[PDB]
């Protein structure tokens, strides 16, 4: 119908933006129309938002400042719009330093109508923003590394040495029980120094534990300083599993002092690399009562010496040291198995601007992915969480993994507002919720439900106001993955009662029959008024229509439904196919917008978003003709055998286009059918040329006229019917130039018969 597919505008392929969604915007003050597009993070462009305009017969894009900047992976970008301004949300990851968890929620920016920053919102630690009484206005009427330096000198007899091995094993087992990030290395020293196993081997706890029992005694002189040096050189390095940011610990286990060590203790301890290593000295045996060995122990250990230095009567007493060492070495990990709650709520997953201050944001991951929505006041910086009432615990568990808040929308009634939400996983076939308010308590309840499992009913919502009176009349709910043969999709059109606000199914829409994979209903949008009848017109996308067929040059479609007084059309008025737009388009029809004049004609236009590109379609003027005819004589006298004069004048009855433009380059083509319906006609054209396929150029005014003559048919006229009214049918048609034309050529109104009948 009305959309001009012969003249598309496309963002350059492999261009700076890899479009994920396209969106039209207009500043109500300056009347400037932009094309906002989104993109994932890439080395070329940090994203996430660009504003694009039509420069040199092409779409050129520049980024929008004061928008949040994602880092690393693409978690998700969400953008919405209203006459109040533009809302941006980015899913962000914050790794809390203390514990082994993650928080995944949104950071948002609310720009004004002209894209100037107004407010910002970070949603980490949400319990400090919340307000369980905020009024819901509706117009009411780096880990830890430990290196053990085991003394193997012969003074330890084999029994004591098995006891020492058991101490190391119990230390490892105990530490792993309460420190998940801990890692271990073992260096056995003496006459020679010997890595039993470095930090890398400790990633397999069972094997490392096994290696401990496998040790063999070196049994020679005590070279402790060399053991420390070797731990410094070989254990604590990036080449053997050590990490720079991680804490570094030592546990020395000796039964005597140094004697005949080639290295020097004081230089080893003072070495540049030692700075930052927490040395613990464990002393065993009677020798340590002597002052010199006590000095050596106090020298190896780090102060406070009472908590790092140690002494034990015999090798049996080691089993008791575990408590003190565990307290003094490993910091408490804290709670890790706590419930989720708002930690992964993913706020900003969907969005909606309610007015200048208030936004409605989706919270799919709210409570074990139960979902919900946050009603946020961007000025006071306080919000209320709305969700399904938990009731008993048996019911709360049943609501898990519904994904409520996957999609959010607002319905406009004659006197009040109403918030609706999407739960595509509800009971495994989907549902749509609605906020029921009863004094203090406001909560979501199911109103509509899907029928097929896995169809993702409620994943897309589109309230439609047909006559633009400020009151929603229909609600479009998509189930894009509906399955008959493959995933074809389905769309449910729901009528809204003017009395109670209830819902009642009116129609079920499906894509073109012939495609098993279409994903029809994945994207829908109310595109303002395109046909120029002052009724809203909807668009739907089938991004998989034609996928994998032939060379796969292009796939995806867009259906255009026109609105009527009785509701949405039964069948689409247009079907734009990716292959007829341009080569290379993949997933044409997964984002859409319309209703703003971007070409300069003053007529509302369209934008369709490919998975990687954006397309802008110019709308065409819709022309309605008015046919008038005059006769001379006004009626044929009985027995008349002369020639009848006819004056046929067409007129542009539509104010869509200026009179001086006429029909531009389109030629008016009309034919005359004289005395239609009679087996043998009583009149006929004076010249067959003059009345068949008559092509004419418009006068450049608001009217066009022609003169024609008709003559009686040859031979005697049948007596069966001699005085019945003669029917003349003037069928007209517009012949438009082929190709890419500067102005959008007119298109005849599809919903008006392209002909008229007059009688003589």
């Amino acid at each position: 119908f009305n959309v001009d597919v012969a003249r598309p505008w496309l963002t350059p392929k492999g261009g700076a933006p890899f479009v994920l969604s396209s969106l039209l915007h207009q500043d109500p003050s300056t009347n400037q129309t932009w094309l906002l597009v989104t993109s994932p993070r890439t080395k070329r462009t940090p994203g996430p938002l660009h504003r694009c305009s039509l420069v040199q017969d092409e779409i050129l894009c520049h980024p929008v400042e004061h928008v949040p900047i994602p880092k690393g992976r693409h978690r998700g970008v969400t953008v919405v719009r209203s006459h109040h301004g533009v809302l941006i949300c980015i899913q962000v990851l914050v790794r809390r330093p203390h514990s082994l968890s993650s928080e995944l929620t949104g950071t948002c920016s609310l720009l004004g109508p002209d894209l100037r920053p107004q407010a910002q919102a970070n949603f980490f630690d949400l319990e400090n923003l919340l307000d369980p009484d905020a009024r819901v206005d509706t117009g009411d009427c780096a880990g830890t590394e430990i290196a053990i330096i085991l003394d193997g000198s012969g003074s330890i007899d084999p029994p004591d040495f098995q006891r020492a091995k058991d101490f190391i094993s119990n230390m490892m087992r105990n530490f792993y029980e309460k420190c998940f990030e801990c890692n271990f290395a073992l260096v056995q020293y003496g006459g020679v120094i010997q890595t039993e196993f470095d930090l890398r081997d400790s990633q397999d706890v069972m094997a490392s534990l096994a290696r401990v029992q496998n040790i063999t005694q070196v049994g020679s002189v005590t070279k402790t300083a060399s053991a420390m040096q070797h731990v410094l050189d070989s254990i604590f390095t990036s080449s053997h599993g050590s990490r720079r940011k991680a804490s570094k610990v030592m546990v020395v286990l000796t039964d005597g002092g140094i004697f005949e060590d080639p290295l020097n203790l004081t230089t080893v301890i003072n070495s540049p690399k030692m700075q930052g290593v927490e040395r613990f000295a464990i002393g065993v045996g009677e020798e340590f009562k002597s002052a010199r060995t006590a000095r050596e122990l106090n020298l190896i250990a780090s102060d406070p010496d009472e908590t790092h230095a140690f002494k034990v009567t015999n090798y049996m007493a080691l089993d008791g040291l575990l408590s003190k060492l565990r307290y003094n070495i490993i910091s408490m990990e804290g709670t890790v198995g706590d419930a989720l709650h708002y930690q992964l709520a993913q706020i900003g997953f969907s969005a909606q601007i309610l007015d200048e201050r208030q936004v409605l944001l989706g919270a799919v991951g709210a409570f074990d992915w139960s979902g919900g929505a946050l009603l946020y006041d961007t000025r006071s910086r306080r919000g209320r969480f709305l969700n399904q009432t938990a009731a008993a615990a048996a019911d709360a568990e049943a609501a898990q993994y519904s994904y409520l808040g996957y999609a959010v929308a607002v319905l406009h009634k004659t006197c009040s507002l109403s918030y609706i939400a999407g739960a595509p996983r509800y009971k495994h076939h989907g549902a749509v919720f609605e906020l029921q308010k009863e004094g203090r308590e406001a909560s979501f309840l199911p109103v509509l439900e899907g029928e097929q499992m896995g169809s993702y009913f409620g994943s897309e919502l589109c309230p439609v106001d047909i006559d633009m009176d400020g009151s929603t009349d229909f609600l479009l709910v998509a189930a894009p993955f509906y399955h008959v043969h493959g995933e074809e999709g389905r769309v449910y059109v729901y009528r809204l009662s003017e009395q109670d606000g209830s819902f009642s199914l009116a129609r079920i829409l499906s894509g073109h029959p012939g495609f098993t994979n279409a994903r029809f209903g994945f994207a829908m949008a109310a595109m303002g008024d395109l046909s120029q009848d002052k009724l809203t017109d909807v668009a739907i996308g089938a991004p998989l229509e034609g996928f994998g067929a032939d060379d796969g040059a292009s796939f995806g479609s867009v259906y255009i439904y026109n609105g009527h007084w009785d509701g949405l059309s039964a069948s689409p008025s247009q079907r734009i196919r990716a292959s007829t737009v341009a080569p290379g388009l993949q997933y044409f029809g997964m984002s859409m917008a319309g209703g703003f004049d971007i070409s300069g004609d003053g007529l509302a236009d369209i934008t369709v978003g490919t998975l990687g590109q954006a397309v802008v379609f110019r709308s065409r003027p819709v022309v309605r003709l008015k046919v008038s005819m005059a006769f001379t004589p006004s009626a044929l006298p009985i027995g008349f055998n002369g020639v009848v004069n006819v004056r046929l004048c067409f007129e542009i009855s539509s104010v869509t286009t200026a009179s001086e433009s006429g029909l531009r380059e389109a030629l008016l083509n009309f034919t005359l059918d004289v005395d239609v319906g009679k087996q043998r006609r009583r009149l006929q054209c004076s010249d067959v040329r003059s009345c068949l396929g008559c092509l004419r150029e418009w006068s450049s005014g608001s009217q066009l006229c022609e003169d024609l003559l008709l003559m009686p048919t040859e031979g005697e006229l049948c007596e069966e019917d001699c005085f019945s009214n003669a029917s003349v049918k003037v069928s007209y048609q517009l012949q438009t130039p082929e190709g890419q034309t500067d102005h959008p050529q007119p298109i005849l109104d599809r919903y008006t018969e392209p002909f008229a009948i007059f009688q003589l």
Epitope: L54, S599, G600, E665, E697, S700, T736, P737, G739, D742
Partner: antibody
Framework: MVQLQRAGPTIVKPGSAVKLSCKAT????????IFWVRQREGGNGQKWIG?????????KYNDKFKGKATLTADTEASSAYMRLTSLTSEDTAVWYC?????????????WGQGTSVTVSS | AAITFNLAPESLVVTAGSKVTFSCKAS????????????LTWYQQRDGKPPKLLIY????RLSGVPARFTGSGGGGTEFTLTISSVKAADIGTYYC?????????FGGGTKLTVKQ
């Protein structure tokens, strides 16, 4: 009726830039296109330059003048402009703004009076 | 790329009251398949004056142009502007012009001269 006026002749040294003008009257300035053509002496005839749509600011250029000319419009003053960058002794010619016929297709239905540019040191 | 024109003869020697006929030919078809019109335009220029529009489509005259001018020139690749009876006011240069595709190009022109 429709008529177009221009600034007039201009003498500029080599290497400079000139911003011609083409005022428009008698019609809606934001509904029709404005085309520019370069007529040169010595049998060079005429060669099309580009277009501009004042209602939207959108432009299109012949590849030969892709980096040379730069058209713009002023909706309030109803006056268009061409900007020639790094003029050379070869750019000497007479230039014409135009207005496409409302019906049918005729790129230059109306012309301005004429403006002559000479690039001499 | 661009459509090329060959407007010959470069000039015509004519006498008042004698039929005249120009001719230019295009390297590509000008018959827009839909409207069936040929997108060629004819211009007239008097020395020291801006050009003027004579015939927009291959055979359609502009308002104000005297009837003695005729477009003719069908085919889609060969066109011929004909004057039934040349006159003094008709002495000038005529250019035919591409109108179907970009870049838009002219044919160089043909100048009329009175015979002596």
């Amino acid at each position: 009726m429709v008529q177009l006026q221009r600034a007039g002749p201009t003498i500029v040294k080599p290497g400079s830039a000139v911003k011609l003008s083409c005022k428009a009257t008698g019609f809606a300035y934001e509904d029709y296109y404005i085309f520019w053509v370069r007529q040169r002496e010595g049998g060079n005839g005429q060669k099309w330059i580009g277009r501009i749509h004042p209602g939207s600011g959108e432009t299109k250029y012949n590849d030969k003048f892709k980096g040379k000319a730069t058209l713009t419009a002023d909706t309030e003053a109803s006056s268009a402009y061409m900007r020639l960058t790094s003029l050379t002794s070869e750019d000497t010619a007479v230039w014409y703004c135009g207005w496409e016929r409302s019906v049918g297709r005729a790129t230059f239905a109306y012309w301005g009076q004429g403006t002559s540019v000479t690039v001499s040191s | 790329a661009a459509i090329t024109f060959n407007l010959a003869p470069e000039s015509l020697v004519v006498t008042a009251g004698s039929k005249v006929t120009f001719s230019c030919k295009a390297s590509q078809d000008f018959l827009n398949s839909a409207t069936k019109r040929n997108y060629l335009t004819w211009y007239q220029q008097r020395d020291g004056k801006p050009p003027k529009l004579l015939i927009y489509w291959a055979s359609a005259r502009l308002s104000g142009v005297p009837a003695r001018f005729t477009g003719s020139g069908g085919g889609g690749t060969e066109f011929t502007l004909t004057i039934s009876s040349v006159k003094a006011a008709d002495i000038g240069t005529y250019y035919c012009r591409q109108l179907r595709s970009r870049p838009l190009t002219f044919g160089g022109g043909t100048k009329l001269t009175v015979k002596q």
